[PDB]
Design an enzyme around this catalytic site. Structure first.
Site, PDB file in Angstrom:
ATOM      1  N   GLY A 146      27.625  14.441 -25.115  1.00 35.34           N
ATOM      2  CA  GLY A 146      26.893  15.014 -24.327  1.00 35.34           C
ATOM      3  C   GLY A 146      27.366  14.188 -22.562  1.00 35.34           C
ATOM      4  O   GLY A 146      27.807  14.240 -21.784  1.00 35.34           O
ATOM      5  N   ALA A 147      27.799  12.714 -23.027  1.00 35.45           N
ATOM      6  CA  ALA A 147      27.581  11.566 -21.923  1.00 35.45           C
ATOM      7  C   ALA A 147      29.549  11.485 -21.560  1.00 35.45           C
ATOM      8  O   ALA A 147      29.590  11.436 -20.508  1.00 35.45           O
ATOM      9  CB  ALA A 147      27.888  10.165 -22.456  1.00 35.45           C
ATOM     10  N   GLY A 174       1.407  -1.151   0.100  1.00 35.00           N
ATOM     11  CA  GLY A 174       0.058  -0.363  -0.139  1.00 35.00           C
ATOM     12  C   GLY A 174       0.923   1.056  -0.175  1.00 35.00           C
ATOM     13  O   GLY A 174       1.976   0.872  -0.549  1.00 35.00           O
ATOM     14  N   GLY A 175       0.141   2.339   0.781  1.00 28.64           N
ATOM     15  CA  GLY A 175       0.625   3.532   0.448  1.00 28.64           C
ATOM     16  C   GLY A 175       2.326   3.672   1.493  1.00 28.64           C
ATOM     17  O   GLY A 175       3.350   4.424   1.663  1.00 28.64           O
TER      18      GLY A 175
END
Ligand code: BTN
Lengths: 353, 168, 176, 176
Positions: free
Chosen positions: A242-243, A5-6
């Site tokens: 970019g890497a 659950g939560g």
């Protein structure tokens, strides 16, 4: 145990989750529900069992065989961290003997002659650290990048590295998130970060660019640029586009940026540079077309697929003989350790989610 | 042997030799004849034996004015980095009179920023060894702009981290 | 989507107005594989972090973890309103009576689904409303939906001089 | 004179407007004996220190160290303007061509001063302008002198909310 659950969004917030194979499960929504919602039939183990959280979701950090292990891993994680973000991580200072061992030398080899042949980055890590001890996090998740902890001179340090063995060491949505929230952890705790660079780029596909690489690859860039704590980089082999930037580059604020002779630091791989440069000198005379093109490729790779441009312009402090690395990182994180740097006033950043 | 890991280690031993001996072997003889030492020989006698860690050792200029791009010495006519004096941290530059008369240029300015900014960052003294003919005139306004960005970060430091100039 | 928007308008001092009508999280084996657990947390972490005035209005459905997420008072939302048609409960009636009846339903399958449909109606009648949350001051008021524009005005008027901070840190460590 | 005035109007939050027309420093053995070196530094140290909006306009002459002194961008001046008649260079043509020609002038004294007067004209034509400084963004713009009162207005309008500080210290250590 179970975390259902939560509830699961408590352990989520928390820095590091440890989960024990076959006897611990996490899930927001039980198999029962997801049957009579989605007609899909799934066991607890597959839904949210240790392995499934470790490898797939990217939710857990570790999956220990038994509880006893798991508890021991937790004590290992505490070891590297300070009690709170007002102290610097527990040390047992030793002074390291920086004469060039026979371990050191091994570095000078362990980049194969063939660009393509892989070689385990786990070595290059364990070379540099105390007692060759690497305490890896999230091993099963995004193997193409390696995150964890060790010690240099008895002082904690955080490690991020591209792992050639997997995907060639190409960054992907999953590696960029795993690394991003390791760096941020190390930074917030004041633990220093040592980055080993092999990366031919980001692993192409349509998926990657639907899921949102754009946003979720950014994460890592944000983390580096944000970080104050000592940042030492070492480029072993490949650093394209970019890497390169991503992987703890100087442009983001990395203090000391080394590069081995083997380093290749260039906008993009030479076939996919020669293309765009020579698209009217490889068009002329379709006769012997390739013969030229794989020439102009073999000049590009000999001219620009090396450290030395990024040296000339002080993007990498030094080109160093791989042996030397555990000296540089020593006598780097001596100086650093009184780094004092901060980012403009602001209640919080706005890092991509 | 070049395309081979070993060859690319034995390249970076070659360019280490060329970098440490940037200045020509009459220019060094001229410097000695003037009773002066060479910038490296200065740096050793400052710093605790073995500390040195040289930064931007393979720097090179990017000016093609007045055929100054005929030679691009590694280091660009200054020796910069970090180590220890009496077992306390300290960042140092040593201008090289052998190289271009030691005239300041853009790159060999932006090295003596990198050191400064590393001192300010870490909180450690900067000991500036001076021996230059003046501005590198070939690089025009460029080599003024370098001076300015030093003289802003000499003021910013001022009173924060000790700055000692050794004029030689 | 909502996490990053909340952050934005909590970095640049813009008050957030929530509206709440959420049965729960999408059930699937994808959602779980693809890290709901980390990537649903982000929203809770944004709410609790944010120190610009928060005003929440539950219109209809607010069950379990999702109730908490959606700018609940637990995560430091200033003024929490609920319309009469708000239902604020651990989890849907059916799921609730499956666990908190399980026995007296397993008894006498003669009229199983039956006694269980009745029980589902009961639990809906008892707790599928904003009246227990009210009792405990989880929602400031229960309001007549027409009166949702007054409360938001008057509430923001007060709320503007809200001063609130989080303990000293270089930055948080939110789920990525 | 100028150092102490800049400080004053940087202590009491008054923006400084410079105008630049300076060939260089007065040459004398007095100036040097009487400590130009310490007492000309003061001006550079005031410029770089000052965190109230700085706007500079080079009208004509701006050579060497004096260019740097006079509220240059290097010492953290916000917006640097130059008129077409600005000349921004390491040092006067004559001095420049004496050092960067020295050879091909020493060649053939038959037409020494001559080839050297030509060279002086050339270097003036090439680099005695604000167009290399422009290229490198040392001066924001080159402007038409009439447009010096607009730029100063618009620039100050922006500049007023300038936030800028110098690293923590009890005080600096400026030349005395
Ligand atoms: O090993 C098992 O028992 C089966 C795997 C999953 C069991 C689920 S997790 C929630 C529920 N609580 C428990 O103690 N067991 C089940």
């Amino acid at each position: 145990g179970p975390c259902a659950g939560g509830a699961v969004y408590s352990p989520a917030i928390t820095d590091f989750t440890v989960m024990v194979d076959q006897t611990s499960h996490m899930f927001i929504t039980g198999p029962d529900v997801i049957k009579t919602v989605t007609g899909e039939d799934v066991g607890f183990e597959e839904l949210g069992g240790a392995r499934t959280h470790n490898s797939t979701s990217g939710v857990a950090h570790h999956m220990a065989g038994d509880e006893k292990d798991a508890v021991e891993y937790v004590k290992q994680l505490l070891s590297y961290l300070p009690s709170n973000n007002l102290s610097e991580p527990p040390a047992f200072p030793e002074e390291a003997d920086l004469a060039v061992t026979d371990e050191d030398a091994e570095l000078d080899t362990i980049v194969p002659d063939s660009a393509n042949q892989p070689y385990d980055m786990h070595s290059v890590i364990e070379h540099v650290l105390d007692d060759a001890e690497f305490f890896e996090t999230q091993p099963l998740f995004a193997p193409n990048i390696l995150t964890g902890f060790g010690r240099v001179e008895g002082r904690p340090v955080g490690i991020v590295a591209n792992q050639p063995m997997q995907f060639a060491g190409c960054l992907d949505i999953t590696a960029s998130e795993k690394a991003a929230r390791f760096v941020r952890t190390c930074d917030a705790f004041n633990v220093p970060v040592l980055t080993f660079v092999d990366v031919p780029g980001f692993l192409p596909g349509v998926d990657q660019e639907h899921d949102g690489i754009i946003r979720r690859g950014a994460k890592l860039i944000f983390a580096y640029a944000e970080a104050t704590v000592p940042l030492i980089t070492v480029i072993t082999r490949k650093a394209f586009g970019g890497a390169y930037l991503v992987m703890g580059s100087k442009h983001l604020g990395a203090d000391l940026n080394l590069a081995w002779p083997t380093a290749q630091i260039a906008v993009m791989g030479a076939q996919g540079a020669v293309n765009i440069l020579h698209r009217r000198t490889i068009a002329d005379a379709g006769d012997d077309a390739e013969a030229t093109r794989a020439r102009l490729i073999q000049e590009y790779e000999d001219a620009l697929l090396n450290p030395y441009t990024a040296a000339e312009r002080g993007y990498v402090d030094a080109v160093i003989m791989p042996s030397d690395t555990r000296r540089h990182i020593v006598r780097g994180l001596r100086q650093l350790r009184t780094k004092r740097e901060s980012l403009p006033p602001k209640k919080h950043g706005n890092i991509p989610l | 042997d070049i395309h081979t890991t070993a060859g690319k280690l034995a390249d970076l031993r070659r360019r280490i030799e060329e970098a440490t001996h940037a200045g020509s072997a009459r220019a060094v003889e001229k410097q000695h004849a003037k009773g002066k030492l060479t910038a490296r020989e200065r740096i050793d006698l400052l710093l605790d034996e073995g500390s040195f860690v040289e930064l931007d050792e393979f720097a090179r200029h990017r000016s093609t004015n007045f055929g100054l791009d005929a030679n691009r010495p590694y280091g660009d006519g200054v020796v910069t980095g970090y180590g220890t004096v009496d077992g306390r941290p300290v960042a140092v530059f040593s201008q090289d009179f052998t190289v271009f008369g030691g005239a300041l240029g853009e790159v060999y300015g932006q090295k003596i920023v990198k050191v400064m900014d590393f001192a300010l960052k870490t909180g450690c003294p900067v000991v500036g060894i001076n021996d230059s003919g003046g501005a590198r005139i070939q690089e025009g306004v460029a080599s003024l702009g370098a001076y300015g960005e030093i003289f802003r970060r000499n003021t910013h430091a001022s009173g924060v981290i000790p700055q000692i100039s050794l004029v030689v």
